[PDB]
């Protein structure tokens, strides 16, 4: 379990250390919220990817995956949110937010969904 | 009535020489309303294009969507390949589970 979390967080590639939570525990059947901070005063696009299979979940302003439980939104000026509307244990694992900035930032977030 | 499939020859593995442009082709039958993304399967994986849009570095990566005779060939070009471009490239279709085809690029220096 420790190996799994560390192997997720080691995938971050950033010049500015991730300012958000990078380990998120939730109970199954509740929503999960993963955050991606972008540079301020610039219009960056982001993309969220699920590492277990490599599935692209969202890219720019729109969901990419056809799994209807996922949405991306803007929480504030510089924070994007990947919203998982009903989490299940099998959603546990590593998620990556890639930003189209000059340093090609990747933030990694480990999601753990616990049994109800 | 078939689901999306990736047709031969897609995502052929290649050895290229430094400075060449390199194409990866993903031929998709029965794409329907599904979508196609190209990814560099490093660790972390890097998104190269999604649907008809190049995600970053438009002077490095180009996408030609829906070309060929049957308008079903998706072509990713990597410009001016360098040693850093070595590795695995994937074509992903957003089926569930995802449909993938991956090819490996080697780059040799003169
Ligand atoms: C390229 O891929 C080769 C085959 O490996 C499999 O597919 C890749 C994309 C990964 O998901 C890996 O876990 C699989 O075993 C590898 O043997 C080869 O080392 C890879 N090359 C590089 C440069 O990563
Ligand atoms: Na292959």
TrEMBL record, chain B:
Subcellular location: Cell membrane
Residue range from the parent sequence: 81 to 190 of 482
Protein's gene: rig-5
Protein name: Ig-like domain-containing protein
Domain of life: Eukaryota
Residue ranges of every copy of the Ig-like domain listed in the record: 4-101
Sites where a glycan is attached: 88
Cysteines joined through disulfide linkages: 26-91
């Amino acid at each position: 379990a420790s190996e799994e979390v560390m192997a997720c967080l080691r995938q971050e590639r950033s010049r500015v250390e991730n300012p958000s939570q990078t380990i998120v525990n939730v109970v199954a059947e509740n929503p999960a919220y993963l955050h991606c901070s972008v540079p301020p005063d610039a219009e960056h696009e982001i993309a969220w990817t699920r590492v277990s299979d490599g599935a692209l979940l969202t890219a720019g302003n729109r969901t990419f995956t056809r799994d209807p439980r996922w949405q991306v939104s803007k929480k504030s000026a510089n924070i994007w949110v990947l919203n998982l509307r009903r989490a299940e244990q099998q959603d546990s694992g590593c998620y990556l937010c890639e930003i189209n900035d000059k340093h090609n930032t990747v933030y990694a977030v480990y999601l753990k969904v616990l049994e109800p | 009535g078939a689901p999306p499939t990736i047709q031969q020859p897609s995502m052929s593995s290649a050895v290229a020489l430094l400075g060449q442009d390199v194409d990866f082709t993903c031929i998709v039958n029965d794409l329907g309303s599904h979508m196609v993304a190209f990814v560099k399967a490093d660790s972390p994986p890097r998104l190269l294009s999604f649907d008809e849009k190049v995600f970053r570095r438009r002077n490095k990566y180009e996408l030609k969507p829906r070309i060929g005779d049957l308008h079903n060939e998706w072509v990713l070009t990597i410009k001016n390949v360098q040693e850093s471009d070595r590795g695995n490239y994937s074509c992903q279709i957003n089926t569930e589970p995802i449909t993938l085809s991956t090819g490996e690029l080697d780059v040799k220096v003169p």
